[PDB]
Amino acid sequence: SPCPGACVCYNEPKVTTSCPQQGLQAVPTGIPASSQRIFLHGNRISHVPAASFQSCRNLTILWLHSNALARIDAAAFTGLTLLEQLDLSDNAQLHVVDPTTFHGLGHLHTLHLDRCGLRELGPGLFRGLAALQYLYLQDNNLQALPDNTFRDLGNLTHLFLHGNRIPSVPEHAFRGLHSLDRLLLHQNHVARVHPHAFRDLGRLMTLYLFANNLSMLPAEVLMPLRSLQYLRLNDNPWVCDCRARPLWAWLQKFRGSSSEVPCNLPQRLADRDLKRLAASDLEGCAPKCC
Numbered sequence: 001s002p003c004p005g006a007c008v009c010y011n012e013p014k015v016t017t018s019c020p021q022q023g024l025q026a027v028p029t030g031i032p033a034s035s036q037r038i039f040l041h042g043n044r045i046s047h048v049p050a051a052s053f054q055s056c057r058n059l060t061i062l063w064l065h066s067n068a069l070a071r072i073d074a075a076a077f078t079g080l081t082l083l084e085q086l087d088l089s090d091n092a093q094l095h096v097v098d099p100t101t102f103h104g105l106g107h108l109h110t111l112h113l114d115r116c117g118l119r120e121l122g123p124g125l126f127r128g129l130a131a132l133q134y135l136y137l138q139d140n141n142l143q144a145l146p147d148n149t150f151r152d153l154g155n156l157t158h159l160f161l162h163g164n165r166i167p168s169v170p171e172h173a174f175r176g177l178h179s180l181d182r183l184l185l186h187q188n189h190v191a192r193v194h195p196h197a198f199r200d201l202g203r204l205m206t207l208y209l210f211a212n213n214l215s216m217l218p219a220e221v222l223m224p225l226r227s228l229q230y231l232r233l234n235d236n237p238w239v240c241d242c243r244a245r246p247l248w249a250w251l252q253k254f255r256g257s258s259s260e261v262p263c264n265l266p267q268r269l270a271d272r273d274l275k276r277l278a279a280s281d282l283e284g285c286a287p288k289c290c
């Protein structure tokens with residue numbers, strides 16, 4: 001078992017093939033089949049062809065971040081049934097992941113897809129990832145959150161979606177995420193949230209929605225959040241008239257930690273906080289009650 005190229009090969013704590021920041025233009029040939037950790041980060045790999053690591057049956061960790069990934073083959077990860085961590089982040093020119101790329105990775109615990117320029121989450125992309133706990137999708141180019149996108153992710157605790165261009169939250173965007181603990185949707189273009197979009201998020205404790213385009217929010221959308229303890233809503237154009245009364249009422253009973261809910265309109269209440277207003281301030285109009 002010769003160590004490929006200028007890689008560093010060692011056995012403890014796990015059999016590791018480390019070849020970082022060597023300017024590699026492709027996955028090196030001859031990676032030992034006993035590899036449990038493969039570090040190919042910081043190079044210049046542009047493609048990941050099919051069965052690139054099929055001999056590493058015991059592969060549990062694979063890092064490909066900070067490369068030049070422009071295309072990943074659909075069968076790139078064939079035979080990696082024991083893969084627990086996959087890192088593809090900091091490849092801002094990836095743009096699109098084939099929807100079959102992650103199939104069969106039933107032991108995957110964490111998946112780093114942040115800063116990959118992702119344009120869309122095609123159907124079936126996260127199918128079958130029943131073990132996944134951490135999913136990093138922030139700092140991409142996402143323009144929609146299709147329904148059932150995380151339907152099989154019953155063990156997901158952390159979903160990072162901030163830093164995209166998501167325009168709204170449909171009803172089934174977060175179906176199945178029963179174990180979800182942290183959900184980060186800030187720094188997007190979220191303008192509306194379906195009243196039942198957070199139906200399965202009864203175990204959620206942190207919800208970040210600041211820096212969006214929310215002008216109102218029906219109190220129904222927060223009602224399923226029985227476990228919530230941190231809520232961010234600042235940097236949104238809140239309308240503080242009759243339409244904000246339900247959100248106002250829910251916030252009066254919230255025992256957790258919440259950010260400012262700054263009023264954008266009317267100018268009389270400019271940058272006042274909704275939770276600190278009186279009910280008499282929320283009368284008249286400036287749909288719904290109007």
Ligand SMILES: *[C@@H]1O[C@H](CO)[C@@H](O)[C@H](O)[C@H]1NC(C)=O
Pocket residue numbers: 033034035055056057058
């Ligand atoms: C994976 O590990 C098992 C037991 O640790 C070993 O028998 C097997 O040969 C390994 N697979 C390789 C080296 O491809």
Ligand SMILES: *[C@@H]1O[C@H](CO)[C@@H](O)[C@H](O)[C@H]1NC(C)=O
Pocket residue numbers: 106130131155
């Ligand atoms: C999901 O989590 C539960 C409890 O943490 C665990 O028993 C189960 O095996 C996990 N799912 C998978 C596919 O490992």
Ligand SMILES: *[C@@H]1O[C@H](CO)[C@@H](O)[C@H](O)[C@H]1NC(C)=O
Pocket residue numbers: 189191213
């Ligand atoms: C917010 O939504 C309004 C429509 O209600 C639209 O005119 C405006 O351009 C949006 N702003 C951003 C930053 O998305």
Ligand SMILES: [Cl-]
Pocket residue numbers: none
């Ligand atoms: Cl590690």
